[PDB]
Amino acid sequence: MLEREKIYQWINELSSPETRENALLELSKKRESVPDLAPMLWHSFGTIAALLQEIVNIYPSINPPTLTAHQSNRVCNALALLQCVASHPETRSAFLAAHIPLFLYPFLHTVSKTRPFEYLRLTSLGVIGALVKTDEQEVINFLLTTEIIPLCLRIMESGSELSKTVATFILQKILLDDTGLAYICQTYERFSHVAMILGKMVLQLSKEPSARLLKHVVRCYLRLSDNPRAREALRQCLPDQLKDTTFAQVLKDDTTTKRWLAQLVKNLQE
């Protein structure tokens, strides 16, 4: 009972800027303990507009990169609430129709390696991640037309171990869709851009390993082998580190990733 009242109060407190900051903090942490939080956020008057205001207010501090720890903490609570709106089945289609991801694209364009920026990009990726996990064709077709693949690949190449995992995960969920695989493999340009980054990643992974990032890079390579045009291209460009005993030690524990790489090499044979 009392628990819900506290939540309803905070949702209503998001509407006035005088209480918005604290209401963001309290709700962003109670986020996982409240299952129906997303439709409560969605069907409360001017709650989404308040969340989007928190995003647009931070735009002048993005470029030039003058975003502070406090500024980042505040916007990342708002982005966390959008993350859960993106996840929920009742609100996901409505969130996409409201083009909410387009507000995060400036954040994903940032390169500043400061923690306020690290957190901003990671939380923003988490929103796209939440949207893709739902394995919805409509999400995929949105993402394909909005040029997220370039933004992901930039992060995938030169981001934090985890933000790289999250961006690779977003690429993976696109590639898993038939239309997504068809799109990336449609032109040599598109495929070559993806494969080059994926390969570059295998090389950094062979130096500084990440058993979770390798799991997603392997799944990406394996999914590309489903397209014959990509399979033939991969017969030439596949990193030698995936063919030999490089990752054999780190994959002693991961029997699933071990299976994927075993299937990939078999798929490439013929």
Partner: peptide, 22 residues
């Protein structure tokens, strides 16, 4: 505040770590 940033980052890290898991 900067001490809280590192915490909130670590929390997001752990959160997204479970999201990518399949």
């Amino acid at each position: 505040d900067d001490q809280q940033l590192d915490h909130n980052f670590k929390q997001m890290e752990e959160h997204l770590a479970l999201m990518v898991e399949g």
